[PDB]
Coordinates of C-alpha atoms and ligand atoms in Angstrom, one line a residue:
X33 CA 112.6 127.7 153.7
X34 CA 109.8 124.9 153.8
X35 CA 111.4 122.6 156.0
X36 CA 111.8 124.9 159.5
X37 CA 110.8 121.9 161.5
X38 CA 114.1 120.5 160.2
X39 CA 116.5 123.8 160.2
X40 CA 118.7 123.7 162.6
X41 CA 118.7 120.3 164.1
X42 CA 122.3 119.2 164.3
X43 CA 124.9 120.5 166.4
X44 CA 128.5 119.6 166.7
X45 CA 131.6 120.6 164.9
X46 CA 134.3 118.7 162.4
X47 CA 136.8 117.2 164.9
X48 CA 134.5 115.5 166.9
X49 CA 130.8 114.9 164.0
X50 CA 127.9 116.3 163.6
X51 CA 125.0 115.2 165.5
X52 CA 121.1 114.9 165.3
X53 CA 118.5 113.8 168.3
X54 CA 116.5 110.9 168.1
X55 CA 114.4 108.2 170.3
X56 CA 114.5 104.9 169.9
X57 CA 112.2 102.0 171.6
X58 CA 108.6 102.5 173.4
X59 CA 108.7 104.5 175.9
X60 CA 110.9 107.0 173.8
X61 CA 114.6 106.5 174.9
X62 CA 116.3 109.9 173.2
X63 CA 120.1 109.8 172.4
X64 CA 122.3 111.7 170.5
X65 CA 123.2 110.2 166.7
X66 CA 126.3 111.2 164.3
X67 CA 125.2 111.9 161.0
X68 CA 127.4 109.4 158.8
X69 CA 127.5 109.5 155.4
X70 CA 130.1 107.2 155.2
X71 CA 128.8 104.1 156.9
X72 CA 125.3 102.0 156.7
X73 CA 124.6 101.0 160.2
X74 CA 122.5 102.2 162.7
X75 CA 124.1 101.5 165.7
X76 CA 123.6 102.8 169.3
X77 CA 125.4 102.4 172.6
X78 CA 123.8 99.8 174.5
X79 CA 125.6 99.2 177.8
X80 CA 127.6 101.4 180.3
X81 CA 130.8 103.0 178.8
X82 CA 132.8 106.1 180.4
X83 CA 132.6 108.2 177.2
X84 CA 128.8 107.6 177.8
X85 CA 126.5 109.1 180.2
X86 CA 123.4 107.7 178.2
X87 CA 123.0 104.5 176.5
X88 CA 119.6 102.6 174.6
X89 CA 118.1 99.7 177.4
X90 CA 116.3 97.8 175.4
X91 CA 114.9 96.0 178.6
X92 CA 113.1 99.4 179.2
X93 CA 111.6 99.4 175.4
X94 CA 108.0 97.2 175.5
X95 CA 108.7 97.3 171.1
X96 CA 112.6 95.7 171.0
X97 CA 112.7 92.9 168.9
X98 CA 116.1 90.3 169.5
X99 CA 116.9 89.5 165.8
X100 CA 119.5 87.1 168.1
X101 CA 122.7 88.0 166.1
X102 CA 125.6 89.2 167.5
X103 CA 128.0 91.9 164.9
X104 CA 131.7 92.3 165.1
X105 CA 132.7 95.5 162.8
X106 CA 136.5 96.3 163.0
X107 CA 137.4 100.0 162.0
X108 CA 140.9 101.8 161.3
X109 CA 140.7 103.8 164.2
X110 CA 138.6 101.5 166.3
X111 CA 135.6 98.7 166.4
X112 CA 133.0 97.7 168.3
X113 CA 130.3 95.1 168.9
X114 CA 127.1 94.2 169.1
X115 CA 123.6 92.3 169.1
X116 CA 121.3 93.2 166.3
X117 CA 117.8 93.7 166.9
X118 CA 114.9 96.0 165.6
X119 CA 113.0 99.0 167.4
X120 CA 110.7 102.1 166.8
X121 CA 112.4 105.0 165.7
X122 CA 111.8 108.6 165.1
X123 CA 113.4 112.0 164.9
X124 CA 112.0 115.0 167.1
X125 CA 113.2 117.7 165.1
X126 CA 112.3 115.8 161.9
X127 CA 109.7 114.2 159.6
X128 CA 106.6 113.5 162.2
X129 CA 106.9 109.8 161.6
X130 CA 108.1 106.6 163.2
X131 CA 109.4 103.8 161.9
X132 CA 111.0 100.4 162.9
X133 CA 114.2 100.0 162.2
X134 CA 117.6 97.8 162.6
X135 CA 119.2 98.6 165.7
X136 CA 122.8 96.8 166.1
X137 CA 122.6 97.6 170.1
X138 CA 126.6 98.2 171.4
X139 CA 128.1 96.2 174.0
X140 CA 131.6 96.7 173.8
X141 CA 133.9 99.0 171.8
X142 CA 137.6 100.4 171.6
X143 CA 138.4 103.8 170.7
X144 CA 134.9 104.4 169.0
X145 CA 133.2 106.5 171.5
X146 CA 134.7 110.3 171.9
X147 CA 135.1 111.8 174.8
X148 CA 132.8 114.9 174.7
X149 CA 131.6 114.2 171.5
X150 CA 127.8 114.6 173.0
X151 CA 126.9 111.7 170.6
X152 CA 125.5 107.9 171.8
X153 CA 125.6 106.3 168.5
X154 CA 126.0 106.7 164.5
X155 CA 123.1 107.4 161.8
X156 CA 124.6 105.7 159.0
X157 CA 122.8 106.8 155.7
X158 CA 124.6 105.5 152.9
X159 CA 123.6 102.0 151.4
X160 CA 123.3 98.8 152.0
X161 CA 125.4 97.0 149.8
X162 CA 128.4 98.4 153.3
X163 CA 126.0 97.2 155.9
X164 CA 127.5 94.9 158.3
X165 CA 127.4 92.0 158.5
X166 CA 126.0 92.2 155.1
X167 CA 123.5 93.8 152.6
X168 CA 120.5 92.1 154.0
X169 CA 120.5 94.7 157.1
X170 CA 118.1 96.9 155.8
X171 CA 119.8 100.1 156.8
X172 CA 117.8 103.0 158.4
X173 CA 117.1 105.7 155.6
X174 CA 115.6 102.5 153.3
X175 CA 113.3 101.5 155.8
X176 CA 112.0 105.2 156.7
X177 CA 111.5 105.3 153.1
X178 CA 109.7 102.3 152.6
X179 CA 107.7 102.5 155.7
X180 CA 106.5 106.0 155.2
X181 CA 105.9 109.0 152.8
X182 CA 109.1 110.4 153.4
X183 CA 110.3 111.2 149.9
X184 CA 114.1 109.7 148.6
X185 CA 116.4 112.1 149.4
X186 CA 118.3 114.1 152.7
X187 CA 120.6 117.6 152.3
X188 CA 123.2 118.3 155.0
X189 CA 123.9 121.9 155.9
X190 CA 127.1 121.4 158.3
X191 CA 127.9 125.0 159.8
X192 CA 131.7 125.3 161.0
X193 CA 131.9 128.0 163.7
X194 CA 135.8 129.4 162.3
X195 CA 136.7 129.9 165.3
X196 CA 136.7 126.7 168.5
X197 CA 133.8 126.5 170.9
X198 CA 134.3 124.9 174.3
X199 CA 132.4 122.8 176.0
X200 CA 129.2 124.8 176.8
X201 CA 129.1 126.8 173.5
X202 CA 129.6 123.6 171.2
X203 CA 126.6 121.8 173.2
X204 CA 124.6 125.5 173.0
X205 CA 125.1 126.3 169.7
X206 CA 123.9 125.5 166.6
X207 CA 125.4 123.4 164.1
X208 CA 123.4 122.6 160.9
X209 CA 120.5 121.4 159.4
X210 CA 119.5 117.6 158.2
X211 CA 116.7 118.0 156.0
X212 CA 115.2 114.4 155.5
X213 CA 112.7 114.0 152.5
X214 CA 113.7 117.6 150.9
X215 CA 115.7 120.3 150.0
X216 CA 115.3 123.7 151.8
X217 CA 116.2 127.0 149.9
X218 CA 117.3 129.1 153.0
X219 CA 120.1 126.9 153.6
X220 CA 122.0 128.0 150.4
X221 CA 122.6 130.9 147.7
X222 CA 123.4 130.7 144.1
X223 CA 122.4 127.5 142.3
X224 CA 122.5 123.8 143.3
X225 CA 124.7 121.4 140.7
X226 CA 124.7 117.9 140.8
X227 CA 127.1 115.0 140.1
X228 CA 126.1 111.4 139.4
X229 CA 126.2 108.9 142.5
X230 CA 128.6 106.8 140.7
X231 CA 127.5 103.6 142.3
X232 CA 125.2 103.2 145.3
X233 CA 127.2 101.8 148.0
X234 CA 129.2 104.7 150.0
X235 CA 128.3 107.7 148.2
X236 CA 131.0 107.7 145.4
X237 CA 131.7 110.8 142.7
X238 CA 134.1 111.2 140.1
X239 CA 136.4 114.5 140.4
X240 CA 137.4 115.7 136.9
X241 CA 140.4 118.3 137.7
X242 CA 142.1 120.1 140.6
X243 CA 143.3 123.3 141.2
X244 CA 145.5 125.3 143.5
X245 CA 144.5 129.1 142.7
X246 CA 143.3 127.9 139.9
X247 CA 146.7 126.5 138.9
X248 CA 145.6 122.8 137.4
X249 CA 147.6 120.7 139.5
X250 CA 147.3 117.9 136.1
X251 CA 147.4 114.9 137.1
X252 CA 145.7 112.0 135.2
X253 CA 142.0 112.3 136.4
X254 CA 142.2 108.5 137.5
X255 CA 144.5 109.7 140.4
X256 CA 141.7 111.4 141.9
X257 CA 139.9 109.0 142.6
X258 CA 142.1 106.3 143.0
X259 CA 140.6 103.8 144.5
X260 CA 137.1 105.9 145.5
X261 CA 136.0 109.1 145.8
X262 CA 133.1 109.4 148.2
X263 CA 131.2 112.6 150.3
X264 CA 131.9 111.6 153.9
X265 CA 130.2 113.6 157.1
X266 CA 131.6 111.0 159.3
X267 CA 135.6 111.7 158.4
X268 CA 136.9 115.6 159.6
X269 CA 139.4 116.3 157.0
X270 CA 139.5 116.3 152.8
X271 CA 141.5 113.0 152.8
X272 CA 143.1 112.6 149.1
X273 CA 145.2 109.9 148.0
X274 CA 149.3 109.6 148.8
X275 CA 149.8 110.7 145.4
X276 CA 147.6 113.2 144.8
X277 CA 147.8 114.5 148.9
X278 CA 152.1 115.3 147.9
X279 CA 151.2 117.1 145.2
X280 CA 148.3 119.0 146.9
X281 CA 150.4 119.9 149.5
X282 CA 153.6 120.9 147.3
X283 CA 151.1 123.3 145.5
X284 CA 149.5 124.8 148.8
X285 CA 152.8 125.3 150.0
X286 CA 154.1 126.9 146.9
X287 CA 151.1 129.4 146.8
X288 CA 151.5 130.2 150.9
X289 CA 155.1 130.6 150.1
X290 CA 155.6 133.8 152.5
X291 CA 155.0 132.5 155.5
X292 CA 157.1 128.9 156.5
X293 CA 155.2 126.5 158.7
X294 CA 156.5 123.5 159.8
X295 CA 156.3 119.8 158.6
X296 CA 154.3 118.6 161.9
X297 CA 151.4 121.4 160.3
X298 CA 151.8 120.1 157.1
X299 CA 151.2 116.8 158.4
X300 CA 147.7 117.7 160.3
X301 CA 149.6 116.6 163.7
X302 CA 150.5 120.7 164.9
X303 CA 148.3 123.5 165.5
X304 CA 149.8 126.7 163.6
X305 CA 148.6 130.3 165.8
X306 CA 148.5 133.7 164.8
X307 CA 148.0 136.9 167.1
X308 CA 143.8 137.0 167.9
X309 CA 142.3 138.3 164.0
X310 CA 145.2 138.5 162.1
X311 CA 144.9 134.5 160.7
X312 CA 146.9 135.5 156.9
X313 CA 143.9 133.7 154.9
X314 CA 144.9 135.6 151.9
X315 CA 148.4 133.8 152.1
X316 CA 146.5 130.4 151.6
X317 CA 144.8 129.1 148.2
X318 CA 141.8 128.0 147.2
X319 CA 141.0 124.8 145.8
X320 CA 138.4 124.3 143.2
X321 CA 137.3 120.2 142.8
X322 CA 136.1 120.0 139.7
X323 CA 133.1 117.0 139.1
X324 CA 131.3 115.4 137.0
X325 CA 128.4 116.6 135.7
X326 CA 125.0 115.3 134.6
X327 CA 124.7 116.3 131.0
X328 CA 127.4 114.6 128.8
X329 CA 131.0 116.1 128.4
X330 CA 129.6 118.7 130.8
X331 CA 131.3 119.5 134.8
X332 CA 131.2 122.1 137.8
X333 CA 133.5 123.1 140.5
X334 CA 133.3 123.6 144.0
X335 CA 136.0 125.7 145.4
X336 CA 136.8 126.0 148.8
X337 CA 138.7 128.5 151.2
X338 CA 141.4 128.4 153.6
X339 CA 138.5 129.1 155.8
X340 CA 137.7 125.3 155.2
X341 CA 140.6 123.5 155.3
X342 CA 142.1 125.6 158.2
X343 CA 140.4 123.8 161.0
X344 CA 139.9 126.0 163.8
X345 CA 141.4 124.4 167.3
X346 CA 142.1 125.6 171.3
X347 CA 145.6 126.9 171.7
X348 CA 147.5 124.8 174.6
X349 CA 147.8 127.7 176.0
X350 CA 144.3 128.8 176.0
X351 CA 145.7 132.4 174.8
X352 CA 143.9 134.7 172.7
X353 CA 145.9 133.3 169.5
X354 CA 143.7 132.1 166.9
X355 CA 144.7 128.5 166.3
X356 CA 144.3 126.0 163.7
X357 CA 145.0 122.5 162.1
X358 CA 145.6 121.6 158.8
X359 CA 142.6 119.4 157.6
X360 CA 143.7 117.9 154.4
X361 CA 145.5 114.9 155.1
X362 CA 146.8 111.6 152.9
X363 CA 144.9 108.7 152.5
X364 CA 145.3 104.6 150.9
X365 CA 141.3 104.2 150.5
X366 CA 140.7 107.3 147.9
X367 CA 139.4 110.8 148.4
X368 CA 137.3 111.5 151.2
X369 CA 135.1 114.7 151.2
X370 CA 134.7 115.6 154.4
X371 CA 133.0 117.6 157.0
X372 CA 135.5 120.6 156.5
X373 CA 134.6 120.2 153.2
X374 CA 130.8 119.9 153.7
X375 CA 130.8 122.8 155.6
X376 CA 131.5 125.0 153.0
X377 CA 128.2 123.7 151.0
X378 CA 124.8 122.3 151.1
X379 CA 124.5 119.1 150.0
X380 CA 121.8 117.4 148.5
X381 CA 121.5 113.3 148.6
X382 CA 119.2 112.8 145.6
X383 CA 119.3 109.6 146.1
X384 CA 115.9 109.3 144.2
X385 CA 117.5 110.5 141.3
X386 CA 121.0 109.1 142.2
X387 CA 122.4 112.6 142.1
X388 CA 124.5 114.5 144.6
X389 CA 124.0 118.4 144.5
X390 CA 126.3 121.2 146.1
X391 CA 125.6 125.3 146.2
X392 CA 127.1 127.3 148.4
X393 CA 126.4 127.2 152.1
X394 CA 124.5 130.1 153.8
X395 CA 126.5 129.6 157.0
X396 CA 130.1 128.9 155.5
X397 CA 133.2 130.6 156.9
X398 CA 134.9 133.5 154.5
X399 CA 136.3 137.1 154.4
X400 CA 135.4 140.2 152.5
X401 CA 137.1 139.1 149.8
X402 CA 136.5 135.5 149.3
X403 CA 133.8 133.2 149.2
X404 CA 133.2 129.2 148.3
X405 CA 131.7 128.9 145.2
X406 CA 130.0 126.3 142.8
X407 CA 129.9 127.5 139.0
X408 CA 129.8 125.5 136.0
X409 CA 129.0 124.4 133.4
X410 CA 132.9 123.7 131.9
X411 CA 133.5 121.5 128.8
X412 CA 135.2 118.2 129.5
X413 CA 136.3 115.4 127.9
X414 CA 136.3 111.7 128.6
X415 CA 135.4 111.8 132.3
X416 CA 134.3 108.4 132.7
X417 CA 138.4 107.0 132.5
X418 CA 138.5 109.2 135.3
X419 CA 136.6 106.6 136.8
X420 CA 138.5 103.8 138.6
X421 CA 137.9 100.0 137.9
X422 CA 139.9 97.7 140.1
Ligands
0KQ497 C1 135.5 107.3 158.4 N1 134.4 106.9 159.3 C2 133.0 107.2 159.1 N2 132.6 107.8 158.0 N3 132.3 106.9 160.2 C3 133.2 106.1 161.2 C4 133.2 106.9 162.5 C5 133.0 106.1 163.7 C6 133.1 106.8 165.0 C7 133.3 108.1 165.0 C8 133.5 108.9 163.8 C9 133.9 110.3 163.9 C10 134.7 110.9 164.9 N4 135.1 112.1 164.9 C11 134.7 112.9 163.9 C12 133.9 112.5 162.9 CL1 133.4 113.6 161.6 C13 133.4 111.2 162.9 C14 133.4 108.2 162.6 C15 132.9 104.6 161.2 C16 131.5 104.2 161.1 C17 132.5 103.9 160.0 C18 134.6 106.3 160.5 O1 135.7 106.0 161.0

């Protein structure tokens, strides 16, 4: 491990994001920043809000700069807005730099802060070309990278509990590791593989195959990643498209056949509980992504456990039951990676090398007889028509 500066700096879990400290204006203001893969914006509450008990007050910050530009950015499960200006930035638990950066400052919003979340704004880290209001909003990993030393790359180490903390342990423990500028060994076992960044703008792969317990579910390639596929730390679930999600599902339930659960589980809407240790993983598949590789008509999978996609929740009646949600769920915008997915590996943004690697996690969930695992190399064919083109 030669990065224990950066070990351990995130806390939070998948329902509600991951999180990393950081400060922002002169003198330092800190708040607490979701790591999002899946956005471009670095974007802070800046007024009073009652999810808040923090926000940035850039009256307070001798180094704010106005850039005098309102943003409006509508999301499917809310939106916000805000005035864009530019500040000094750093990360305590991070590189021992600071840099100046966009800020879009928040000043009203609508079901974008979460209540007990612990987080103030968002980190996004993928590129530019989904900045809002547009590409020429330098987003904040580009500037730390141009401004400094800080070499082109981030890995995310997102460590799911398996079982739900409550308020005081999910703000006492620990909940991953953002390594910026490197890649530290302690965090993973086995060997890191890596897919091509298919273009730079979220941070898009190409899944090759799918399996069910190693069943193929055989579907033309071009399904799974219809329209996108991207690695996403900023959505919960594995999101996979309608078509590909009902035939996901028909498999998973096939293979977890014994036990019935209903179709509000299925759906990701019900919590399913089992008597305190006796959760039937063994009932439950795993399901091996197969992507592309980076030597031609070569791929690897990642294969995840129950212990992923299960994601661990408080029974309403607070029993001893252990409780969970289903966290693969359908989506119209193309496969989504995320955290409960994430938190079975570490994964490497190479974006120097526009790469994306995965190994195992040293803090992911399993039993005595199961782990996640990424192997390769496999031989296959033609994997750029698994590519879509609109
Ligand atoms: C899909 N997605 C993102 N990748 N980030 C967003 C976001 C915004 C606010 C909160 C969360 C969030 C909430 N709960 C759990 C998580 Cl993991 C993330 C995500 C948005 C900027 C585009 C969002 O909707």
């Amino acid at each position: 491990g030669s990065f224990v500066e950066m070990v351990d700096n995130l806390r939070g879990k998948s329902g509600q994001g991951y999180y990393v400290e950081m400060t922002v204006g002169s003198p330092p203001q800190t708040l607490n920043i979701l790591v999002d893969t899946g956005s471009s914006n670095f974007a802070v509450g800046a007024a009073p809000h009652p999810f808040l008990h923090r926000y940035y007050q850039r009256q307070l910050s001798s180094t704010y700069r106005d850039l005098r530009k309102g943003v409006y950015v509508p999301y499917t499960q809310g939106k916000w807005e805000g005035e864009l200006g530019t500040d000094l930035v750093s990360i305590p638990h991070g590189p021992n730099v600071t840099v100046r950066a966009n800020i879009a400052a928040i000043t009203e919003s609508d079901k974008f802060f979460i209540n007990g979340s612990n987080w103030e704004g968002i980190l996004g880290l993928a590129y530019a070309e989904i900045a809002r209001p547009d590409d020429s909003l330098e987003p904040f990993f580009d500037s730390l990278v141009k401004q400094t030393h800080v070499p082109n790359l981030f890995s995310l180490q997102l460590c799911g509990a398996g079982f739900p903390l409550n308020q005081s342990e999910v703000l006492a423990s620990v909940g991953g590791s953002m390594i910026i500028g490197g890649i530290d060994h302690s965090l993973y076992t086995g060997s890191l593989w890596y897919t091509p960044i298919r273009r730079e703008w979220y941070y898009e792969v190409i899944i090759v195959r799918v399996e069910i317990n190693g069943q193929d579910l055989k579907m033309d390639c071009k399904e799974y990643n219809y329209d996108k596929s991207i690695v996403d730390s900023g959505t919960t679930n594995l999101r996979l498209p309608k078509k590909v999600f009902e035939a996901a599902v028909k498999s998973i339930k096939a293979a977890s056949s014994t036990e019935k659960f209903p179709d509000g589980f299925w759906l990701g809407e019900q919590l399913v509980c089992w008597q305190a240790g006796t959760t039937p993983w063994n009932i439950f598949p795993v399901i091996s992504l197969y992507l592309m590789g980076e030597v031609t008509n070569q791929s690897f999978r990642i294969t995840i456990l129950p212990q992923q996609y299960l994601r661990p929740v408080e029974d309403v009646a607070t029993s001893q039951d252990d409780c969970y949600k289903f966290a693969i769920s359908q989506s119209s915008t193309g496969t989504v990676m995320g955290a409960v997915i994430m938190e079975g590996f570490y994964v490497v943004f190479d974006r120097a090398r526009k790469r994306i690697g995965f190994a195992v996690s040293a803090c992911h969930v399993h039993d005595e007889f199961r782990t996640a695992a990424v192997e390769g190399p496999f031989v296959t064919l033609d994997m750029e028509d698994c590519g879509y083109n609109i």
